[PDB]
Each structure stands twice: as structure tokens, then as C-alpha cells.
Amino acid sequence: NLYSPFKPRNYQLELALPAMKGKNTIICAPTGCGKTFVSLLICEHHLKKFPQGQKGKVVFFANQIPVYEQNKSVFSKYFERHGYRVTGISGATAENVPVEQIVENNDIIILTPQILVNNLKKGTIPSLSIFTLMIFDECHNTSKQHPYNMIMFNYLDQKLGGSSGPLPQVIGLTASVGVGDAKTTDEALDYICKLCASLDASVIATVKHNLEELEQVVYKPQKFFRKVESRISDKFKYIIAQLMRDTESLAKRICKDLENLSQIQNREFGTQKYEQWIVTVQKACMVDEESRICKALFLYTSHLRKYNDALIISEHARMKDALDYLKDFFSNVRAAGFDEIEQDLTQRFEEKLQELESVSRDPSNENPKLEDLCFILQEEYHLNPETITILFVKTRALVDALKNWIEGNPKLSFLKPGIHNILIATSVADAQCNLVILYEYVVIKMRGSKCFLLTSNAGVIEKEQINMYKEKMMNDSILRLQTWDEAVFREKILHIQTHEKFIRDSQEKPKPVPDKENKKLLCRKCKALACYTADVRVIEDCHYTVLGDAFKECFVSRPHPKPKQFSSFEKRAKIFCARQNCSHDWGIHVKYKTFEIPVIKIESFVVEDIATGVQTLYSKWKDFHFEKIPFDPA
RNA sequence: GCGCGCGCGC
RNA sequence: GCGCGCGCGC
Ligand SMILES: [Zn+2]
């Protein structure tokens, strides 16, 4: 892909120009236009421009590991013939290697930003002056408390409170600078100017002179929005909902306080949030004596899940599909395993089968949205018949529902659906597709194409039109500030930077006063006493452990199938409340400096005042202001 | 374990 | 800000 002798399009040269002039630039161009190659050009010119005797140093920031890897590879291959030493550092590297010496012995360093934040903090890397060029990938993240913005806080602290050493050139790559919570074009302009100030950029580089050349290869689908209406009378949903109430009551019979077993609140039937609730409930009940209870509970939650699925299918396909799904499920349950609970469940289902059948086959309960879909399909194909279509639905079951519905629609006899001899690809998640339809879907980021958005929800339409308006404000604002003289703009930016810096330095949180009184840490679920706060030690300023052998007998440990390591310790296992019927998630168990020690999260605990009985809940240790004692190998 | 960003609700 | 959820990082 990015590995063949790339020959530049004119727009890439145009984009590369201001950066090669030494200007701090935000390069803004669509996804897949070759901003990476542009960055290669800029890096090449930058390194090559130094007179013999001098040498530059370039750091490229990547936010995700895959990007880190792919650009490490690309950069390593591109500057092969040049002789430049190319390396990279990620959380998989450090802390295994001495970073300062790596940065010193290399010319092109690909980094995840948090590495650099860490090494600026610890002072291992003293100044950003060892770099002559910085490249930020996805530079629009340079805002708020993002690592990019921290690095740039270091940069700007060096620039404003002036400091002897030279600052590197800063380059940013993005496809959209964003507008934040802008409602007016002026607020958009202010936001964009703020982003430019955060990156110390004086130029926004967009394609202007070679726009035609760009648009000729950019996926810009014709956006179509179609608001559809849903059924007024749905008795199917009423019935299934009653079944689900029955099942949840049955579940509460074997698990009181099921209502406080998950943190997900105000669940509703036939939603993805309910699905998530099922997931968390099954999670918070892993399958001695408690395992039986959890197995029963598992059966109940499984059936609830099937019911939820069916409700969704009924919402977006036809009742027949939902009932068919349910019938396959219950047939399968009847087949491979007869249990008391299960047979009871299928039995409670079969007492409702006939009424469900009647509501299903009722032609007044048919789904109006499918008519709209059908008509869109007809209209699009009865024009261009060699049309290949991709259709996005929101569940795996809705795929099969839609497919069955298509293959059984006389008005759609010309279609051959698939999940070359396939006209329609129906799917859930993932350019050469000339027809895209988002049939009630939850995202179009990836030679005459259009995109349809079918939904019964008006808020989705609203959201989309809002997004488009924001796009327009963004582009207009960018043109506007591109008109300005660079010096005026630099003055403005400078004083924005001064303002922001002052705000940062002033709004430092005043150091908190700790209540040095000893308090109780109880299990949040079962309320059993886990420990006391005086046995608690802070590790690496952000992590919390408990001392003593007394605590070792208060938690059981289950081995982590994903033993990942960080720049501090290795997550070996997870820990739980040792009461053999609670088993609440308490945190993890780590290997830290050859020590095998527990690390706990305050969100799994209640803080009780000993003298009283006053309890308090904390989600973050940072908000729990008690006497925080440092850890010590003793 | 902690940190960062986004979405939804109040 | 709080709650919930998703995504990413050390
Ligand atoms: Zn417990």
C-alpha cells in the first residue's frame, strides 16, 4: 500500500509546501488522500536540508499501536536508502530500554505520546530541543488533557517563559479540525484558532489549487435522509414484554437485589442497553454453591437476551421474523438439554405462542418502514441495475431478518442478497459500493455513489444535519483565516497562548488536606470489611495496595487470560471478595518490582467512618482525600 | 490498576 | 459535574 515508489499527486506537493518553508502547519485533508506520503516528503526535506556537519531529529506521534507499527514500518522502509536510523518506542518497549540514549542514537523516532509525557515528567528527556521537527498524527486531539496537549504544554512553557534552546518545528495531520460546541461561525473560528494556538501553528494547509484533482478521487456520497414512521399498535411487544417481566421475576426469586447487581440503570426492553445490562449481570456472577445459583441466573438471563433480540427484530423487520427467531431458539433449547428451569421457560413461552402467532400474521401489524426500504431499492435499481448495494443494520439477527424479508419480497425479486453473484451485502460493521443504506443504523468513516439514512428517530436526522452544519462552519472559518496575513495571525495566536498559559498556571489545584483519621474499606457489594485505610500504600503516586497478611485472606484470585504489562507492573490476575457467594470485582494482582501484590480500586469499596457508621462512596482515588502513605520495600 | 478521548442521560 | 456506555493508551 504505502510501500511502492509513490509518485506525488500535485495536491500532495501543494500540501507539503508550507511545512517545507519551515512554517508550523496543520495539514488538513480527507482520509486516504496520502497525508502519510506528505509527511514522508516533509520529513525527507527536513532531514535533507541540514548542511553537512549538522543533523536533524524527527519525532512522529501515533495514538494507537496499529498506526505506530504501520508508520514505523513505512518510515523505516522509505528512509532505507538514505541511511537514517529509524526506531520506535511504545508501551511494549519501555520500560525495557533507556529512552534518552535511543532518542540520541536515532534520527526518526516513532512514539506513542504518553511515552514522551512520561519522560518529560520524569525529566529523563530534559527539553524538546533534541527534536528539530515534531509530527502529530490526528492532530485534532491536541486539546483538553490529551497527551498531545501535555507535550505542547511543555513546548509552550518553553516558548512563552522563554528559554535559550531552539524549539522544533511542529506539524499536524488531520482530516477534520473540528468546531467543538460551536453554534455560530464565530465560535467555530475561535475554536479553530484555539487549536492552532495549542499547536503553535501559523498555517492551515488545505488543497486549493488542485481541488478538481482531489475531488476526482475522494469518496463524497450523495447524502439522503428519509424519516420513516413506525407501527402504532404493537401487541407483540406488549406480550414479549410481559414474558420478560415474568422471567425477571423468576430470576429475582433466586437472586434478591438483582436490581443492584449491575450498575446500568433504568433498563428498557428491546434496547442495546438492556443487552449490556444482561452482559454485566452475567459478568457479575461467574459460574461452588454460588455457581449453581449463577447457572440458573445464567439460563434466565440467556432467555431474557433472546427476548430482547426478538423485540429488536420486531422493531425493525417483521413480527414473523422475531417469532421465527424465538421458535428456532426454543426448539434448540428443547433439543439439546431438558432442565427444570429451561422446560419451565419454554412452557411459559408456549402458553403465549398462539396469541403471538395471531398478532404476527395480522396484516395490520405489518411494518411500514420495510415498504420505504423496498421502494428506495426499486427506485435505485430500476434506474441503474448493475448497482451493488451495502446495507447496514444494527444486529446480527436483523441481518438474517432483512435477508429473509428480501428473498421473500416479490417486489424485490431482482435482488440476490449476501452476508460477484451478490447484489446486496447486508452487514453490521466494517468505497467501491455505489449504494449505501443505513437502515436504522448506529458512521461512514473509511464513481457516482449515494448514501441513504432510513430512521424512525428524528434525533438521528437532527444529529446528522447538525454535523453537516458544523462541517460548513469549519470550512468557511478555515477559508476566512487562510485569507489573513501570517503576522497578524501569529500575533493573535501568541496572545491566545499567553492567556491559556496563565489559565493553566493559575488554575493549579490547591494541594488537598488529608483526613488522617483511619477509616474502613468494606466490600461495596456484600459490605464485608476488606481493610483499613492505614494499611493502604500508594504506588507510583497513582496506584493503591494493602499491606499485611491479614488482607491476603480476604480476597480470592482468578488468573488473567490476558497478562498484559505496563511501564510499572505486570497484571498477572484479577482479585475478588473472598466470601464464596459475593465474588465482587476488587481490582487486580500484579508483579511489581519482583513483588506479587494486590492493586485495588476504590469504586469496589464503601468507606465507613469507624466511630460513627457514616458511609461514603468514591469512584476515583484522586477524590478520596485521606492520609496517602507512600509504598516502601520493607 | 491508573490515565485520555468520545457518545448518551440528568 | 454526576451516572452509564463505548474506544484508545501506559
Ligand atoms: Zn463482598
In angstroms, how far is B5 C1' from A280 CA?
Answer: 23
Which cell numbers hold the place of A122? 520524569
Tell me which DSSP letter residue A141 carries.
Answer: G
Alpha helices by DSSP H, A226-289 = 235-254, 272-283
Are the CB atoms for A370 and A318 separated by under 8 Å?
A: yes
Angstrom distance (rounded) from CA A616 to CA A528: 15
Measured between alpha carbons, how far is residue A548 from residues A385, A534, A536, A609 in Å? Answer: 74, 11, 10, 21
User: Any atom of strand B under 7 A from CB of A168?
Assistant: no
User: Any atom of strand B under 7 A from CB of A571?
Assistant: yes
Angstrom distance (rounded) from CA A171 to CA A27: 7
Measured between alpha carbons, how far is residue A344 from residues A278, A308, A324, A331, A426 in Å? Answer: 20, 19, 20, 14, 36
CATH 3.40.50.300 fits A1-218, yes or no: yes
Q: Which residues of A424-452 are buried (b: 16+ CB within 10 A; e: fewer)?
A: bebeeeeeebbbbbbbbbeeeeeeeeebb
Are the CB atoms for A76 and A111 separated by under 8 Å?
A: no
The rounded Cα A527 to chain-centroid distance in angstroms is: 33
Q: Looking at domain A516-634, what is its CATH homologous superfamily?
A: RIG-I-like receptor, C-terminal regulatory domain (2.170.150.30)
Which cell numbers hold the place of A435? 449504494
Domain positions in chain A are 1-218, 219-233+367-457, 234-366, 516-634
Residue A600: nearest nucleotide (C-alpha to C1'): B1
Angstrom distance (rounded) from CA A116 to CA A153: 12
In angstroms, how far is C5 C1' from A167 CA?
Answer: 41
Crossing angle of the two packed helices A353-361 and A235-254, in degrees rounded to 10: 150
Q: Could you tell me which residues come within 8 angstroms of residue A490 by beta carbon, excluding any fewer than 6 positions away? A: A202
Question: Which technique was used to obtain these atomic coordinates?
Answer: X-ray
Angstrom distance (rounded) from CA A548 to CA A634: 11
| Residues placed in the known binding site of A for ATP | 29-36
| Residues placed in the known binding site of A for Zn(2+) | 523, 526, 577, 582
Tell me which DSSP letter residue A167 carries.
Answer: P
Handedness of CA A89, A94, A96, A99 (dihedral sign): positive
Q: Count helices and strands (H / E) in chain A.
A: 18, 24
Q: Could you tell me which residues come within 8 angstroms of residue A172 by beta carbon, excluding any fewer than 6 positions away? A: A25, A26, A27, A135, A136, A139, A140, A142, A199, A201
User: Any atom of strand B under 7 A from CB of A176?
Assistant: no
Measured between alpha carbons, how far is residue A364 from residues A238, A239, A367 in Å? Answer: 16, 17, 9
- Provide residues 280-319 of A with CB closer than 7 Å to any strand C atom: 280
In angstroms, how far is B6 C1' from A357 CA?
Answer: 43
**What is the Å distance from ligand 1's center to A554 Cα?**
9
| Residues placed in the known binding site of A | 29-36, 523, 526, 577, 582
In angstroms, how far is C5 C1' from A280 CA?
Answer: 11
User: Any atom of strand B under 7 A from CB of A599?
Assistant: yes
- Number of Cβ within 10 Å of residue A454's Cβ equals 22
Measured between alpha carbons, how far is residue A530 from residues A35, A197, A554 in Å? Answer: 54, 49, 6
**What is the Å distance from ligand 1's center to A526 Cα?**
4
User: Any atom of strand C under 7 A from CB of A567?
Assistant: yes
Are the CB atoms for A628 and A538 separated by under 8 Å?
A: yes
Q: What is the Rg, in whole angstroms, of the alpha carbon atoms belonging to chain A?
A: 30
DSSP assignment string, A512-571: PPPB-S-EEEEETTT--EEEEGGGEEEETTTEEEE-SSTTTTSEEEEE-SS--B-SS-EE
DSSP assignment string, A375-407: HHHHHHHTT-TT--EEEE-SSHHHHHHHHHHHH
User: Any atom of strand C under 7 A from CB of A195?
Assistant: no
**What is the Å distance from ligand 1's center to A606 Cα?**
11
**What is the Å distance from ligand 1's center to A578 Cα?**
7
Q: Which residues of A367-379 are buried (b: 16+ CB within 10 A; e: fewer)?
A: bebbebbeebbee
User: Any atom of strand B under 7 A from CB of A143?
Assistant: yes
**What is the Å distance from ligand 1's center to A538 Cα?**
23
Greatest CA separation for chain A: 88
Residue A622: nearest nucleotide (C-alpha to C1'): B2
Are the CB atoms for A576 and A600 separated by under 8 Å?
A: no
Question: Which nucleotides of chain C are near protein (any atom < 7 Å from a CB)?
Answer: 2-6, 8-10
CATH of the domain spanning A234-366:
1.20.1320.30
Residue at minimum CA to C1' distance from nucleotide C6: A276
Which cell numbers hold the place of A246? 415474568
**What is the Å distance from ligand 1's center to A586 Cα?**
9
- Secondary structure of A14-52 in the HEC alphabet? HHHHHHHCCCCEEEECCCCCCHHHHHHHHHHHHHHCCCE
**What is the Å distance from ligand 1's center to A524 Cα?**
7
Given this chain, do its domains A1-218 and A219-233+367-457 carry the same CATH topology? yes
Question: Which nucleotides of chain B are near protein (any atom < 7 Å from a CB)?
Answer: 1-6, 8-9
**What is the Å distance from ligand 1's center to A528 Cα?**
6
Tell me which DSSP letter residue A54 carries.
Answer: B
- Backbone phi, then psi, for A308, in 5-degree steps? -55, -50
Angstrom distance (rounded) from CA A491 to CA A489: 5
Angstrom distance (rounded) from CA A63 to CA A41: 21
Return the ∠ at Cα A492 (arms to A488 and A495), rounded to 5°. Answer: 140
**What is the Å distance from ligand 1's center to A577 Cα?**
5
User: Any atom of strand B under 7 A from CB of A545?
Assistant: no
Q: Looking at domain A219-233+367-457, what is its CATH homologous superfamily?
A: P-loop containing nucleotide triphosphate hydrolases (3.40.50.300)
Angstrom distance (rounded) from CA A396 to CA A384: 29
